[PDB]
């Protein structure tokens, strides 16, 4: 199982803050592809070579491996400061 969090535009488009997905994926990208394929709104939300990801609260490339218990977050380029 992997707990998936969303922020900003990604959150608005998917319509939820978080979801717990009880399935195994090898990488962040594999998870992204399977989530995006649910429906049109999901594909819109998880589209892009700009999209960012964090695993266990560390920014990470999309080839980063996933295991049971990880926290994964998808979000747009940051705009703080």
């Amino acid at each position: 199982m992997v707990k998936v969090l969303f922020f900003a535009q990604v959150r608005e488009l998917v319509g939820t803050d978080a979801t717990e997905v009880a399935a195994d994926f090898p990488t962040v990208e594999a998870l992204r592809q399977h989530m995006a394929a649910q429906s049109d709104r999901w594909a819109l939300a998880l589209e892009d070579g700009k999209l960012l990801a964090a695993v266990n609260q560390t920014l990470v490339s999309f080839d980063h491996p996933l295991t049971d218990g990880d926290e994964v977050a998808f979000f747009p380029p940051v705009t703080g400061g």
Binding site: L5, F7, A8, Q9, A54, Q57, T58, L59, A73, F75, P76, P77, V78, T79, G80, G81
Partner: protein
Amino acid sequence: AETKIVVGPQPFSVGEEYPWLAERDEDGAVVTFTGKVRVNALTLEHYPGMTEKALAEIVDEARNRWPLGRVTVIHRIGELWPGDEIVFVGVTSAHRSSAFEAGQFIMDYLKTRAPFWKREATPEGDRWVEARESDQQAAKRW
């Protein structure tokens, strides 16, 4: 030396933050940066937990590159208004070049690595602020 990291909606005052930063006689140089919002509310969304962790990691890396004394990083969240101060970075060092360099480094990294997102208000609806490639360049140069 000590590090202060604060993420919250409450306003800060440079006049309140400066004395703690400047307390130590061994730190001859003190650099501060304040970033402000330049009618339409801005809201700052963040990732609870990761935001504080990210900020702590940025200061950690700055301490590896420069001999720093006290450091303070404050970033506000929630709804803010034009003119509100959004971010404060304070750094001390024995000498001025380390304080200036580290202060700018911390901001460059905060702008590219800290999970914050700005949404603006405008007459006909909300608009998410766009990130800038120039900030990626500013960060990677270090």
